[PDB]
Design an enzyme around this catalytic site. Sequence first.
Site, short mmCIF file in Angstrom:
data_model
loop_
_atom_site.label_atom_id
_atom_site.label_comp_id
_atom_site.label_asym_id
_atom_site.label_seq_id
_atom_site.Cartn_x
_atom_site.Cartn_y
_atom_site.Cartn_z
N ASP A 137 0.97 -1.11 -0.12
CA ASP A 137 -0.08 0.10 0.12
C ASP A 137 0.96 1.31 0.00
O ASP A 137 0.44 2.28 0.53
CB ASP A 137 -1.00 -0.09 1.10
CG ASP A 137 -2.18 0.94 0.99
OD1 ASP A 137 -2.54 1.24 -0.37
OD2 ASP A 137 -2.75 1.44 1.91
N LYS A 144 1.93 4.73 -1.04
CA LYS A 144 1.36 5.94 -1.75
C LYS A 144 1.54 7.11 -0.91
O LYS A 144 1.91 7.15 0.40
CB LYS A 144 -0.33 5.87 -1.88
CG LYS A 144 -1.11 5.27 -0.58
CD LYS A 144 -2.44 5.00 -0.81
CE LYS A 144 -3.45 4.91 0.50
NZ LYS A 144 -4.60 4.45 0.29
N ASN A 188 0.59 7.65 2.40
CA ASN A 188 1.01 6.68 3.59
C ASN A 188 2.37 7.02 4.02
O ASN A 188 3.03 6.26 4.83
CB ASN A 188 0.86 5.12 3.19
CG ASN A 188 -0.54 4.75 3.26
OD1 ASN A 188 -1.42 5.51 3.62
ND2 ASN A 188 -0.91 3.66 2.78
N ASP A 216 1.54 3.46 8.13
CA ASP A 216 0.29 2.73 7.67
C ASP A 216 0.79 1.39 7.24
O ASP A 216 0.79 0.99 6.01
CB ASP A 216 -0.66 3.31 6.89
CG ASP A 216 -1.63 4.13 7.57
OD1 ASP A 216 -2.74 3.55 8.01
OD2 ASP A 216 -1.64 5.43 7.56
N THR A 261 -4.48 0.04 -3.00
CA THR A 261 -5.24 1.18 -3.69
C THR A 261 -5.20 1.24 -4.88
O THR A 261 -4.19 1.29 -5.75
CB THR A 261 -4.40 2.41 -2.81
OG1 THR A 261 -4.43 2.20 -1.47
CG2 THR A 261 -4.99 3.86 -3.19
#
Lengths: 16, 268
Positions: B129, B131, B134, B150, B170
């Site tokens: 994840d 991104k 995060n 995260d 995501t």
Amino acid sequence: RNKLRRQHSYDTFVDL
Amino acid sequence: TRFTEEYQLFEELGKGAFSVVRRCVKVLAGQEYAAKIINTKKLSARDHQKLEREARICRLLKHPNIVRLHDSISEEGHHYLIFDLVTGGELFEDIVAREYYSEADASHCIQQILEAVLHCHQMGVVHRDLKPENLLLASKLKGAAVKLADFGLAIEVEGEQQAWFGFAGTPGYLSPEVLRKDPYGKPVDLWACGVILYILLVGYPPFWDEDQHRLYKQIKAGAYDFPSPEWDTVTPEAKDLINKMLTINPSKRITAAEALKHPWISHR
Ligand SMILES: Nc1ncnc2c1ncn2[C@@H]1O[C@H](COP(=O)(O)OP(=O)(O)O)[C@@H](O)[C@H]1O
């Protein structure tokens, strides 16, 4: 072009 | 049990999914931290599994470009994750506010991100994840460290053993192997790094569409490009790294170790 918007985290496949 | 005794709550830093982050101090030590306060009573079966996973996985990770978990405490109806304090907000809000980064600042940024991802991998953690949302910045100051956060969707891997660990992450940042429901592993984080680098340099992402079906078509096909004029004055070695990261076959896809040795990161 596409511009940058915030995206959320999914913990499963969710057809959108 | 033992948070109320060692830690003093202070001012709210942010809200979230039945969470509330406050600044806290460990009284005796005097040192200040961020306490993520989670409501056990309002959490799903599935949310508890993540909390436990997030806690277990974060404990493995000691690195300057990862947000450190110092403590995880379970009292009646409330769970406290004690983290490094970070006061610079998300990489996301900084890309939006500055629109895009120079090749200089993009290189420095992704270099830290790649050292975070490399540590994760060497400890058998895949993030899944990556991104801007995060990634957080240490402070509001100049050249503040980018810190990965995260780990709610992070998985443990044994060596280089690929497997179907589930559809998680995501949409915009997901890898083709996940979209193809293939066994995957460490390489998925390097596709996300690809997307982050692209975003860093022109301020928009390589894959978009209103229709999630189409977005996934593009990503599976690796249908991105370097439009004129904004990409025209961007070095071929910058693009070279993105291509090497946005490689639809994870086998031929560049690794965190390799990416850090890439001439666009290594010298300048
Ligand atoms: N260590 C930290 N220091 C300061 N603020 C933090 C820290 N961790 C999270 N925050 C902030 O607290 C809010 C909620 O964070 P959290 O619930 O942990 O995750 P998310 O922001 O993904 O929902 C956000 O504004 C986030 O940036």
